GROMACS .gro file of C-alpha atoms in nm:
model
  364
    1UNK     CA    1   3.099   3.598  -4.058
    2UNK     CA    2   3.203   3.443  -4.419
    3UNK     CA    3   3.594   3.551  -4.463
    4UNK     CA    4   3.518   3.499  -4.867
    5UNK     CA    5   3.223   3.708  -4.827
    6UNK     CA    6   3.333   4.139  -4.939
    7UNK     CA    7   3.637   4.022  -5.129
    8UNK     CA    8   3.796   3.902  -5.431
    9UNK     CA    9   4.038   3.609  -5.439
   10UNK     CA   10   4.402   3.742  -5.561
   11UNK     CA   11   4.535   3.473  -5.832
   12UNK     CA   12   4.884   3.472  -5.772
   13UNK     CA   13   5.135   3.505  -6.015
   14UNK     CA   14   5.368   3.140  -5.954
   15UNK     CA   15   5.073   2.953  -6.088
   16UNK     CA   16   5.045   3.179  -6.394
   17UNK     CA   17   5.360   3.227  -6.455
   18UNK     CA   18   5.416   2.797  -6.511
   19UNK     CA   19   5.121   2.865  -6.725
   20UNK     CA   20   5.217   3.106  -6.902
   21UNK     CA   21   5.624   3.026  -6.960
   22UNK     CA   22   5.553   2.658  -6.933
   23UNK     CA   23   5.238   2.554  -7.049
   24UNK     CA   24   5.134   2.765  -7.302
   25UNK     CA   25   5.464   2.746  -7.491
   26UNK     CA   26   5.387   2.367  -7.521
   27UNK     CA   27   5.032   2.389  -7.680
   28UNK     CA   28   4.992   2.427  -8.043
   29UNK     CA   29   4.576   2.459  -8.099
   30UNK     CA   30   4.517   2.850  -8.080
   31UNK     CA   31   4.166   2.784  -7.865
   32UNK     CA   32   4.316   2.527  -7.627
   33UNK     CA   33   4.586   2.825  -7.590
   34UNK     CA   34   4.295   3.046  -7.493
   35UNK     CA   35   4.171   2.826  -7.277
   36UNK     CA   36   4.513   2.803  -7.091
   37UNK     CA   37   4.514   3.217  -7.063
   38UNK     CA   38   4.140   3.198  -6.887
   39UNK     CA   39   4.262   2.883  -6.611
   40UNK     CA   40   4.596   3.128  -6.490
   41UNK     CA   41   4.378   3.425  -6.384
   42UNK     CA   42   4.131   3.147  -6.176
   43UNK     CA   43   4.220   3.199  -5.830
   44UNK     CA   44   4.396   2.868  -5.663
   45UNK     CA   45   4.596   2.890  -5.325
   46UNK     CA   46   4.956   2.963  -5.305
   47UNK     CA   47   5.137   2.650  -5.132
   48UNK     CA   48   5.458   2.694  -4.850
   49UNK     CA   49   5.570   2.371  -4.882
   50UNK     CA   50   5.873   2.456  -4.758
   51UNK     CA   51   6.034   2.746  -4.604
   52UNK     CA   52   6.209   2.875  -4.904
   53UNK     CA   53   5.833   2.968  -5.022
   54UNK     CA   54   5.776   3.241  -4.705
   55UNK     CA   55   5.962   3.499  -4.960
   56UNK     CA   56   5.679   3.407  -5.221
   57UNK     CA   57   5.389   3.470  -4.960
   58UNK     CA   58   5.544   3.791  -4.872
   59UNK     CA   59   5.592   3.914  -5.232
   60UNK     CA   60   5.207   3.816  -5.274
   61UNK     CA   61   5.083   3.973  -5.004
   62UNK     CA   62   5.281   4.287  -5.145
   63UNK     CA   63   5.136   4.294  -5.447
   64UNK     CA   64   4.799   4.227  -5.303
   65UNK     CA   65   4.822   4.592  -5.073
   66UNK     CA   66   4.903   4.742  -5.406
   67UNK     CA   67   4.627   4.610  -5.563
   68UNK     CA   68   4.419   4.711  -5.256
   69UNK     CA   69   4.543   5.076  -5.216
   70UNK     CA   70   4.456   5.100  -5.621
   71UNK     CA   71   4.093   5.047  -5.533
   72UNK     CA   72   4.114   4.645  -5.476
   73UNK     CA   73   3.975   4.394  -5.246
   74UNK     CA   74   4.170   4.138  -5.268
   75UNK     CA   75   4.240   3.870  -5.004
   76UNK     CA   76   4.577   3.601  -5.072
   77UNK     CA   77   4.492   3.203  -4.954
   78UNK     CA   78   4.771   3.042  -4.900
   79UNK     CA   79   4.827   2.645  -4.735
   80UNK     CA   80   5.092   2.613  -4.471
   81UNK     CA   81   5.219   2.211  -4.513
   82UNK     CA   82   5.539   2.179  -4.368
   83UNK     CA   83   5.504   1.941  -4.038
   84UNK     CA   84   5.801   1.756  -3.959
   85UNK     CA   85   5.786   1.402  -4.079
   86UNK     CA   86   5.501   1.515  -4.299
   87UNK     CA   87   5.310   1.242  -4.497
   88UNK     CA   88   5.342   1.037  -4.252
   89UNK     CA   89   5.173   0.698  -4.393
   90UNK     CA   90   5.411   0.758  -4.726
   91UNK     CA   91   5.627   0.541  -4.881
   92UNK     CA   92   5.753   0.863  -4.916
   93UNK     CA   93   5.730   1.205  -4.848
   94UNK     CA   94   5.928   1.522  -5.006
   95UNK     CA   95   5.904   1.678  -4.640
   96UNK     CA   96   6.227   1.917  -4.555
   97UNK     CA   97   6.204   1.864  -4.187
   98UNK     CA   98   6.232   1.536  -3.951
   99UNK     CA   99   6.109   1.489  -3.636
  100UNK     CA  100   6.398   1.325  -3.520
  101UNK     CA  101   6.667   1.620  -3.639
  102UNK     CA  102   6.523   1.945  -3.500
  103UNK     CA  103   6.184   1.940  -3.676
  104UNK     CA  104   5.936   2.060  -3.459
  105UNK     CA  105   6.213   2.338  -3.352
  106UNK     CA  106   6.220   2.396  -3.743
  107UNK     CA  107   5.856   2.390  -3.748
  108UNK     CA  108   5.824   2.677  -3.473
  109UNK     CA  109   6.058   2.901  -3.710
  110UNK     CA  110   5.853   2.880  -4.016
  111UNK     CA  111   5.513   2.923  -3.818
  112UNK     CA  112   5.706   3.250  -3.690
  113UNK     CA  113   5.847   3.332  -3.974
  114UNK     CA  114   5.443   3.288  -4.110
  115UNK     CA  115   5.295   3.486  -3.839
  116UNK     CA  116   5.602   3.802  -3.907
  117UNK     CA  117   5.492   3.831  -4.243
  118UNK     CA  118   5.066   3.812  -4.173
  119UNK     CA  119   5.140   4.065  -3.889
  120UNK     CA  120   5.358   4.282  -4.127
  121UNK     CA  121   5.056   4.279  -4.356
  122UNK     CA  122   4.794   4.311  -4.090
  123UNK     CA  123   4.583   4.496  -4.395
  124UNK     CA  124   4.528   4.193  -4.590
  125UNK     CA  125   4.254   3.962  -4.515
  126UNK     CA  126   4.468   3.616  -4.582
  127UNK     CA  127   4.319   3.280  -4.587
  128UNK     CA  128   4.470   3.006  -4.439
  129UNK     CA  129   4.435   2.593  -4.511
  130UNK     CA  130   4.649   2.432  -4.235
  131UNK     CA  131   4.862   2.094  -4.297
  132UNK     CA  132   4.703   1.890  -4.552
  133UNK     CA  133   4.690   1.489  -4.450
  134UNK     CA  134   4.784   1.523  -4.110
  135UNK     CA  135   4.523   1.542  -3.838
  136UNK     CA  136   4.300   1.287  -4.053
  137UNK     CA  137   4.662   1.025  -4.047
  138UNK     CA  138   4.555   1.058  -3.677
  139UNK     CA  139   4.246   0.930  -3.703
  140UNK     CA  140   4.277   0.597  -3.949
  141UNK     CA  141   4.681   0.570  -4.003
  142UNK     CA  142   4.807   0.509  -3.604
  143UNK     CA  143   4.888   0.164  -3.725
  144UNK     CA  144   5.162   0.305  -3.953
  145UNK     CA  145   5.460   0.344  -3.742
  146UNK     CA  146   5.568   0.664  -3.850
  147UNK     CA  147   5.274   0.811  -3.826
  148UNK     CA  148   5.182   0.634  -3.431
  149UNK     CA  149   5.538   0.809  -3.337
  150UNK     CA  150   5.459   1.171  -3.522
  151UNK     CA  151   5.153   1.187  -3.299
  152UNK     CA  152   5.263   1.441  -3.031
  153UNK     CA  153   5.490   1.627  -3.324
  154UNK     CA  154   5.210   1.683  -3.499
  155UNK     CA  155   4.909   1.763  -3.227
  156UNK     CA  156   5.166   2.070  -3.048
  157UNK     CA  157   5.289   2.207  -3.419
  158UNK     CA  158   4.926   2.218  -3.478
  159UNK     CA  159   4.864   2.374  -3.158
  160UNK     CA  160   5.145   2.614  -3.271
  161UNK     CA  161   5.016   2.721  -3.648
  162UNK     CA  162   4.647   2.783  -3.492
  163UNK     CA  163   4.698   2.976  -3.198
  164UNK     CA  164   5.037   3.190  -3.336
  165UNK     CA  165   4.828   3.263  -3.667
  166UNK     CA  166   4.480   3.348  -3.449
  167UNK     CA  167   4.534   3.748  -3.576
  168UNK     CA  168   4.228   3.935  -3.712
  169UNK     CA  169   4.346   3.961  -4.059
  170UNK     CA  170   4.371   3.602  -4.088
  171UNK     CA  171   4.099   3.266  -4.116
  172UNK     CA  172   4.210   2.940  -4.101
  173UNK     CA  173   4.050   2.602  -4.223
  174UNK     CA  174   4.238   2.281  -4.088
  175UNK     CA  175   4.276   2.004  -4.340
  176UNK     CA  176   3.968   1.750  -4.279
  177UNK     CA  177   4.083   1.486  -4.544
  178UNK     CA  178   3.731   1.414  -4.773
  179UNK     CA  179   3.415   1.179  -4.781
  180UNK     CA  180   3.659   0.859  -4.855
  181UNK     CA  181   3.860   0.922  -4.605
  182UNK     CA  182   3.682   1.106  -4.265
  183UNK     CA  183   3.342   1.067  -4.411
  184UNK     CA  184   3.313   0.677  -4.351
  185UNK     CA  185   3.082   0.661  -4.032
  186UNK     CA  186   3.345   0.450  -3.843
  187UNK     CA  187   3.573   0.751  -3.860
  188UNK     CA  188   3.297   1.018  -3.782
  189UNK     CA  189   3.325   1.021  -3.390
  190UNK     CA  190   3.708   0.961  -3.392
  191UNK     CA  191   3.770   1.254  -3.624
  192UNK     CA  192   3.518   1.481  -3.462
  193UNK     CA  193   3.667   1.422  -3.154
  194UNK     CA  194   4.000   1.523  -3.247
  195UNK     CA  195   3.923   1.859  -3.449
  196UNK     CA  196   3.727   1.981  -3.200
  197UNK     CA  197   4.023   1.878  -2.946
  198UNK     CA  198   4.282   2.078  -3.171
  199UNK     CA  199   4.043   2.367  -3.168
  200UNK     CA  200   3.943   2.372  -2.783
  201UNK     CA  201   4.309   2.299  -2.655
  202UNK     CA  202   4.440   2.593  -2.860
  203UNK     CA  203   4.130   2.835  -2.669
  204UNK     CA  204   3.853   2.808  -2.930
  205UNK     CA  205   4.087   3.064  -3.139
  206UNK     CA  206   3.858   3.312  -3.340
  207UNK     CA  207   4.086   3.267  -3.659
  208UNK     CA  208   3.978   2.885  -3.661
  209UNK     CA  209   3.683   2.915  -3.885
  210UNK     CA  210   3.637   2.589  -3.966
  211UNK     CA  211   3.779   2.311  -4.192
  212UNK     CA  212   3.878   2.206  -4.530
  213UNK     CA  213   3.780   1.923  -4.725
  214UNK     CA  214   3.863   1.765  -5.076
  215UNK     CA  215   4.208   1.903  -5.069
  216UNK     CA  216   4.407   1.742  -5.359
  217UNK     CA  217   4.160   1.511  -5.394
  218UNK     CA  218   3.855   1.466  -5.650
  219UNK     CA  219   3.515   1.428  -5.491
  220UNK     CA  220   3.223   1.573  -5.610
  221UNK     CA  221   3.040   1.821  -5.429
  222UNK     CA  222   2.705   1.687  -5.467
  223UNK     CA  223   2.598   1.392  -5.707
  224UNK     CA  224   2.231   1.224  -5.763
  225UNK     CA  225   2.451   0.877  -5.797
  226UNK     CA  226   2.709   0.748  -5.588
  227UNK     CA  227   3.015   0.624  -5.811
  228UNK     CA  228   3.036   0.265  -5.768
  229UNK     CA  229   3.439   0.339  -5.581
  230UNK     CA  230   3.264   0.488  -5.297
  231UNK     CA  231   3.049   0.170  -5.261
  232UNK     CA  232   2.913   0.122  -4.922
  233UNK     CA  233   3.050   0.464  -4.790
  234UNK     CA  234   2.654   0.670  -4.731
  235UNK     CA  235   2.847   0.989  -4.742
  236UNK     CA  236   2.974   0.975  -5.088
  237UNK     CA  237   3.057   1.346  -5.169
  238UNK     CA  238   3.177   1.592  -5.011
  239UNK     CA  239   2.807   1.752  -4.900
  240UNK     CA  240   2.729   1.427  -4.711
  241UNK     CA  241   3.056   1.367  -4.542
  242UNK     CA  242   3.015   1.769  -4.467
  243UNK     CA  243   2.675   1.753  -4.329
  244UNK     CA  244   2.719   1.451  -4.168
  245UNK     CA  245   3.059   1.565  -3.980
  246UNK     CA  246   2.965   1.999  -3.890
  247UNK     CA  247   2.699   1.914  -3.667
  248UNK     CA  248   2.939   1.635  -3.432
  249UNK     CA  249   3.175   1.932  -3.452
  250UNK     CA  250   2.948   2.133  -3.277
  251UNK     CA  251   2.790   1.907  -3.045
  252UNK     CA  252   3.148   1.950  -2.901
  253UNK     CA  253   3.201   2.264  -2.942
  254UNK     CA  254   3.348   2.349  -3.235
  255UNK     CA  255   3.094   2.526  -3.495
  256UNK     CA  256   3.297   2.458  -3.793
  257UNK     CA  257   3.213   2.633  -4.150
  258UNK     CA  258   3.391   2.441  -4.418
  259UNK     CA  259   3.590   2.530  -4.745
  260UNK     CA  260   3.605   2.238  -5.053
  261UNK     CA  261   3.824   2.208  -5.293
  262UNK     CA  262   3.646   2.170  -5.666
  263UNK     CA  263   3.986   2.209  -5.818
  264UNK     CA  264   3.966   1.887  -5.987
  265UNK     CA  265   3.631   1.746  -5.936
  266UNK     CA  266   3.484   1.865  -6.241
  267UNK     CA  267   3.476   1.530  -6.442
  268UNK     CA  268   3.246   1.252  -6.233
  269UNK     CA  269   3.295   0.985  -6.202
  270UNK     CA  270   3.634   1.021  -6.199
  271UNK     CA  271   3.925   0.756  -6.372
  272UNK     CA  272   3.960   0.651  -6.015
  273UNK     CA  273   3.931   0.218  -5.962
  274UNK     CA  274   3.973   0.237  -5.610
  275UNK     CA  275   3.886   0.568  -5.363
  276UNK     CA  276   4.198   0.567  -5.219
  277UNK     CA  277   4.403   0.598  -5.491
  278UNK     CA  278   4.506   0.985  -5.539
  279UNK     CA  279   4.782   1.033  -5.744
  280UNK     CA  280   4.739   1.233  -6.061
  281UNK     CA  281   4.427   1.069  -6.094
  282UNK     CA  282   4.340   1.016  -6.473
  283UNK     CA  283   3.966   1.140  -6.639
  284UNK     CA  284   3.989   1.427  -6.409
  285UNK     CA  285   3.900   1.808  -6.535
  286UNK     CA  286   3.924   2.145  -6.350
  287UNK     CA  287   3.558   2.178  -6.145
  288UNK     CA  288   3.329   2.481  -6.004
  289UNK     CA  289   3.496   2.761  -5.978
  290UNK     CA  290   3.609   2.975  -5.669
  291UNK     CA  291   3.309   3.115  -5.512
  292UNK     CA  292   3.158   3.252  -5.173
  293UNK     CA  293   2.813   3.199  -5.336
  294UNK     CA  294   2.793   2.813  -5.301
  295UNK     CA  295   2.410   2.811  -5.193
  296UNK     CA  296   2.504   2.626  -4.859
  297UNK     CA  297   2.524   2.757  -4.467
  298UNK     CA  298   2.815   2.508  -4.410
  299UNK     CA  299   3.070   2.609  -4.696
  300UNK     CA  300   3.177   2.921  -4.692
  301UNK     CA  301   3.337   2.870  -5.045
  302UNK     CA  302   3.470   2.669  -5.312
  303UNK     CA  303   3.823   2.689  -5.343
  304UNK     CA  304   4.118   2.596  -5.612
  305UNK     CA  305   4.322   2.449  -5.319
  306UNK     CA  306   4.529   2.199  -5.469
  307UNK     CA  307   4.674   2.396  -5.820
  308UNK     CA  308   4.563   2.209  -6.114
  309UNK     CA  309   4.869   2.111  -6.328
  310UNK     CA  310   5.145   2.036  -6.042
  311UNK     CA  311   5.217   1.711  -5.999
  312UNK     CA  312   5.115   1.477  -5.699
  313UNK     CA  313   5.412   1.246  -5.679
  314UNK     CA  314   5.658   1.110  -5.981
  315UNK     CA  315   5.585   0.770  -6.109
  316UNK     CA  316   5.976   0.702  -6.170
  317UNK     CA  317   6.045   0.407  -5.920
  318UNK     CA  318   6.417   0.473  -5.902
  319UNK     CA  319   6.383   0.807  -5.795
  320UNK     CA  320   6.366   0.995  -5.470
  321UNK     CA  321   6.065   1.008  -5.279
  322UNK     CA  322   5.873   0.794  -5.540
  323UNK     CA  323   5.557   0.637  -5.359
  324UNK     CA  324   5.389   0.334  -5.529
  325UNK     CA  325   5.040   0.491  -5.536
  326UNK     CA  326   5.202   0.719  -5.845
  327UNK     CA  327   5.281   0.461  -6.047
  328UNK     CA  328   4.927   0.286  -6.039
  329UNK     CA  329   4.698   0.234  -6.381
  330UNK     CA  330   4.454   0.557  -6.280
  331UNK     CA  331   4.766   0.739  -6.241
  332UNK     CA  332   4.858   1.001  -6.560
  333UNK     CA  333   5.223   0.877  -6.610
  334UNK     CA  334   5.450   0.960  -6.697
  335UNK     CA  335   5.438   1.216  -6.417
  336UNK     CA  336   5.721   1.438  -6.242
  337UNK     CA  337   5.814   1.510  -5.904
  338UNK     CA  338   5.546   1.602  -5.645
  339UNK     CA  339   5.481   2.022  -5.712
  340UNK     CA  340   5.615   2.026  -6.015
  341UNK     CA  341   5.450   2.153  -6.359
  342UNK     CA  342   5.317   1.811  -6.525
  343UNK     CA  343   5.230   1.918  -6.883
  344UNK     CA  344   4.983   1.645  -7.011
  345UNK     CA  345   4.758   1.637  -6.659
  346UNK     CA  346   4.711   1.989  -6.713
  347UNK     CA  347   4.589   1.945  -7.046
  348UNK     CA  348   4.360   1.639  -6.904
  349UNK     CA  349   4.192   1.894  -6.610
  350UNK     CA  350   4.129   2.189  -6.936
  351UNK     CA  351   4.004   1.944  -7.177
  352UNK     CA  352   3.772   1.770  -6.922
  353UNK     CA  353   3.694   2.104  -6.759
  354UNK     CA  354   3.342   2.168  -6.633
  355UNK     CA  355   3.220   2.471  -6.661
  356UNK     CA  356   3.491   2.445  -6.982
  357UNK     CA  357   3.765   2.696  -7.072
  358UNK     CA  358   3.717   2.613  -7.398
  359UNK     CA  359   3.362   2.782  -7.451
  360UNK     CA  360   3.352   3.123  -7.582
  361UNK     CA  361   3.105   3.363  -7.435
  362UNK     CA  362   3.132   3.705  -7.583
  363UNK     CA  363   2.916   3.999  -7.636
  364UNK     CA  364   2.964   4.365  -7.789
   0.00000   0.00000   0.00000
């Protein structure tokens, strides 16, 4: 049943080659340089943030079948996050496509131009997370005005991803925000209600495995103390908010397995002062590393989701797209523009890395 169960996970070559060509170039200490080498062959998910990226997924997915015909078993993972007014509860978001201008018309196009390319490589098992923050906006952000009008944008594009990408080759995990965010018990029934909507108005899709937490954010998976920013939250990592929120899935109908992102939950507590602050969040290190083998029935794996290194948001005020959360105390600054290689926050996640990088473990 496990899609991460029988293969390995390809690491792609645009995060190694900004470490490599980027990174590397900039460190001096010949271990920490080591280090860097190891984190570019860890396996994180290749992001289509805009449509401009489809070539990217298709050259992957290339090189994966000729890995695979030479004897590999490699699957890609890749996270489709282009909705029309995306980010919806932003100050700012660097979305390409509006709602108001063509955008769920644009959106259609790039979930085809998606579905060509899985279809066209029908021979590669290819892992999907599906629109990061949008479906949890739904649940706690209708007061926002932007996001109260993207409401019926974003439930049919949805609706469009999951059923035109419900192909054999392919599982998807909808974005499920994390235990600060979905895992309060206020929002349980509200968000249960509407995954398990999305998934029974698109015909219980066989492709929909489940869901995916943590994404770009910093929880741990499972800790003996609560840090004192989740304070009075009871689900205050990602195992409670996940055991608390699979079995209201499937009490309607939707029997969710879930995928977590430990790509930068290594270092707990983290430098966060309040939960819901997530921009390149300092005291933050690179966390458990991809596995199927994560000793629990409801997670099918931990994942590298969000690719440690690329920045969340700038923290320049005067420039485009800027949102105030990236200019906050607990934010690394300064910091660059949303995707793009931020030098010294990849140093933070190796240096506070757990397991570390930095360890040497060598026999003859």
């Amino acid at each position: 049943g496990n899609p991460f169960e029988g293969v390995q996970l390809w690491a792609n070559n645009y995060y190694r080659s900004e470490v490599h060509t980027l990174a590397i170039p900039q460190i001096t200490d010949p271990a920490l340089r080591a280090a860097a080498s190891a984190v570019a062959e860890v396996p994180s998910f290749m992001w289509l943030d805009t449509l401009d990226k489809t070539p990217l997924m298709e050259q992957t997915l290339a090189d994966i079948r000729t890995a695979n015909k030479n004897g590999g078993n490699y699957a890609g993972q890749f996270v489709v996050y282009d909705l029309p007014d995306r980010d919806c509860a932003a100050l700012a978001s660097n979305g390409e496509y509006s709602i108001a201008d063509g955008g769920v018309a644009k959106y259609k196009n790039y979930i085809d131009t998606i579905r060509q390319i899985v279809v066209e490589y029908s021979d590669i098992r290819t892992l999907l997370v599906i629109e990061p923050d949008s479906l949890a906006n739904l649940v706690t952000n209708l007061g926002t005005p932007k996001c109260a009008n993207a409401q019926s944008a974003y439930l049919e594009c949805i609706n469009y991803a999951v059923t035109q990408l419900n192909l054999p080759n392919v599982a998807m995990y909808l974005d499920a925000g994390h235990a600060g965010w979905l895992g309060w018990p206020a929002n349980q029934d509200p968000a249960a209600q509407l995954f398990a909507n999305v998934y029974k108005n698109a015909s219980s899709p066989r492709a929909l495995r489940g869901l995916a937490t943590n994404v770009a954010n910093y929880n741990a998976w499972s800790i003996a103390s609560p840090p004192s920013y989740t304070s009075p939250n009871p689900n205050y990592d990602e195992k409670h908010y996940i055991e608390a929120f699979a079995p209201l899935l499937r009490n309607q109908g939707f029997d969710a397995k879930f995928i977590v992102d430990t790509g930068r939950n290594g270092k707990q507590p983290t430098g966060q002062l309040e939960w819901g602050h997530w921009c390149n969040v300092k005291g933050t290190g690179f966390g458990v590393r991809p596995t199927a083998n994560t000793g629990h029935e409801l997670v099918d794996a931990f994942v590298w989701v969000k690719p440690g290194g690329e920045s969340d948001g700038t923290s320049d005020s005067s420039a485009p797209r800027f949102d105030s959360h990236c200019a906050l105390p607990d934010a690394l600054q300064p910091a660059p523009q949303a995707g793009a290689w931020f030098q010294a926050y990849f140093v933070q996640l190796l240096t506070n890395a757990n397991p570390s990088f930095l360890h040497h473990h060598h026999h003859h």
